[PDB]
């Protein structure tokens, strides 16, 4: 699961080049197969790592097809791969018959001549076709060891082995919202309590065989969904011949979430010419929206 977190952060790379895939939109694609190619170049010689660019470090050491479709990186290591008394540790091939093929590696070590010529070290002009770099400390910008990491992205006919990261949402608590905790779908109010779950227990149900709570798959293992407000709304009418004002009688509610739903237009039986002036809450309240709680008898 390629997260691509170390590539965006720590902006210290010299050349962050992407050819086929977008440099920004990478947390959503599902690549078929990825590969890594690591090598150390000498300073400004990193100019032939693009499709079409030819030269001496493009057909003798590492080749590249016309359609690479991937990103490449390069970070400076002058303070690591450089000494003050000789850093002869990296070499490159610059003499070979023809050009290399896409994704080809050759570790041969033998003098080359396209006329036979076994090339005993002195024959007339025979020499080793491998020159060493000039890595030192007191040099210029164009003579510094650069480690180029080539990320070969592929989209061949294969299942989605490598994909982007899966960003989780925020934890909206104390509100009747939809929840999806890795398969557990539905709608409820996320509120904590004083229960004690076991380390191996992932989710928990109630006595009515209904999902009660579950640890957050993300982090901060706490309780989970509580049921929302519901019931049978009744109408209190003192008689059509007497008056024409009524009052809602929401069966079993706290008279606090219903007011928020009405003020935010969230309740299903939302009348168009209805308002709210006062809310009373008792045992089996039936919030009397439009009535006064007088202390008489």
């Amino acid at each position, epitope marked *: 699961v390629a997260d691509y977190s170390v590539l965006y952060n720590s902006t210290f790379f010299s050349t962050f080049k992407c050819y086929g895939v977008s440099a*920004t939109k990478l947390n959503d694609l599902c690549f078929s197969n990825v590969y890594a190619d690591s090598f150390v170049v000498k300073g400004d010689d990193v100019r032939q790592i693009a499709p079409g660019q030819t030269g001496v470090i493009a057909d003798y050491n590492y080749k590249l097809p016309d359609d690479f479709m991937g990103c490449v990186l390069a970070w400076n290591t002058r303070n690591i791969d450089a000494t003050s008394t000789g850093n002869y540790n990296y070499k490159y091939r610059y003499l070979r018959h023809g050009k290399l093929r896409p994704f080809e590696r050759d570790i041969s070590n033998v003098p080359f001549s396209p006329d036979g010529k076994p090339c005993t070290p002195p024959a007339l002009n025979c020499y080793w076709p491998l020159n060493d770099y000039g890595f030192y400390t007191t040099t210029g910008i164009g003579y510094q060891p650069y480690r180029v990491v080539v990320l070969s992205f592929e989209l061949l006919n294969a299942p989605a082995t490598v994909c982007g990261p899966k960003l989780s949402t925020d934890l909206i608590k104390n509100q009747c919202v939809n929840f999806n905790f890795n398969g557990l779908t539905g709608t409820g109010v996320l509120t904590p309590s004083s229960k004690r779950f076991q380390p191996f227990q992932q989710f928990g149900r109630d006595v009515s065989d209904f999902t009660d709570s579950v640890r957050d798959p993300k982090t901060s293992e706490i309780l989970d969904i509580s049921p929302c407000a519901f019931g049978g709304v009744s109408v209190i009418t003192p008689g059509t011949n007497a008056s024409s004002e009524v009052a809602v009688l929401y069966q079993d509610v706290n008279c606090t979430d219903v007011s928020t739903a009405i003020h935010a237009d969230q309740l299903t039986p939302a009348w168009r010419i209805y308002s709210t002036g006062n809310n009373v809450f008792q045992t089996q309240a039936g919030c009397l929206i439009g009535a006064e709680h007088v202390d008489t008898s």
Partner: antibody
Framework: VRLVESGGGLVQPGGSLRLSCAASGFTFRNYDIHWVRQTTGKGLEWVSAVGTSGDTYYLDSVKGRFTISREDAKKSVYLQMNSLRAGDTAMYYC????????????????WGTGTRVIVSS | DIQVTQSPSPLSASVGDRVTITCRASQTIGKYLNWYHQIPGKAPKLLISAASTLHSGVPSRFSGRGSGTDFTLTISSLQPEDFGTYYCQQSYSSPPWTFGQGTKVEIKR
């Protein structure tokens, strides 16, 4: 989807002056934000752009000088211009790029209005 | 980088319906090449997609073709309100994000 520019440029080369780019009702949490430089008859070279993650890219010429900052809830993108030179006076825009399937290309369809940082006096 | 060139001289407009707006480059690209349009006076805008993803906003008369390394902009009968400079941007290299040069379409007189 529409963006409105603000501010401008009045300081001399060698000072600091930031810009801003607003947004609209579109969901500005997964798309990107780019910058366009129009010098009225020259090239438009800019790659500096930030995304949802910690992606902070800069141009090869002007690197380590101009900083980028975006805010999802505020729906505003800022661009501070530190160590301004004399050859950067042009019109700055703000666009949005996106790909159809996942990564085909960048749209850059919705443009803005444009802002100039005329230096000197 | 991807050296993209355009027409050296701006082509005018007439009663015809054939233009020579090209977006040739150095390397070869399959479909990683878009097309824009900048009216002189206002901000630019997207005109032609990558020949297969034409979106809304732009009329269906504005067509787009391209294959191999030679790209051509096949436009239908031009309109007096659809003139300006047409730009194009390559999509084969992310660091060197560069636009076109400019192909103004003025009216024959």
């Amino acid at each position: 989807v529409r963006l409105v520019e603000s501010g401008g440029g009045l300081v001399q080369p060698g000072g600091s002056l930031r810009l801003s780019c607003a947004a609209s009702g579109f969901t500005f949490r997964n798309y990107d934000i780019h910058w366009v430089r129009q010098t009225t008859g020259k090239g438009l070279e800019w790659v500096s752009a930030v995304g949802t993650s910690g992606d902070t890219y800069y141009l090869d010429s002007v690197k380590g000088r101009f900083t980028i900052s975006r805010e999802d809830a505020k729906k505003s993108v800022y661009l501070q211009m530190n160590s301004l030179r004399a050859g950067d006076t042009a019109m700055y825009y703000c666009v949005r790029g996106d790909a159809s399937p996942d990564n085909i290309y960048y749209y850059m369809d919705v443009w803005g209005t444009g802002t100039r940082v005329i230096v000197s006096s | 980088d991807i050296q993209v060139t355009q027409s050296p001289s701006p082509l005018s407009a007439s009663v015809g319906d054939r233009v020579t707006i090209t977006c040739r480059a150095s390397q070869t690209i399959g479909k990683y090449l878009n097309w824009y349009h900048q009216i002189p006076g206002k901000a630019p805008k997207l005109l032609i997609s990558a020949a297969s993803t034409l979106h809304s906003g732009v009329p269906s008369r504005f067509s787009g073709r391209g294959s191999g390394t030679d790209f051509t902009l096949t436009i239908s009968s031009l309109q007096p309100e659809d003139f300006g400079t047409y730009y194009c941007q390559q999509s084969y290299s992310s660091p060197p994000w560069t636009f076109g040069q400019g192909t103004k379409v003025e009216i024959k007189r």
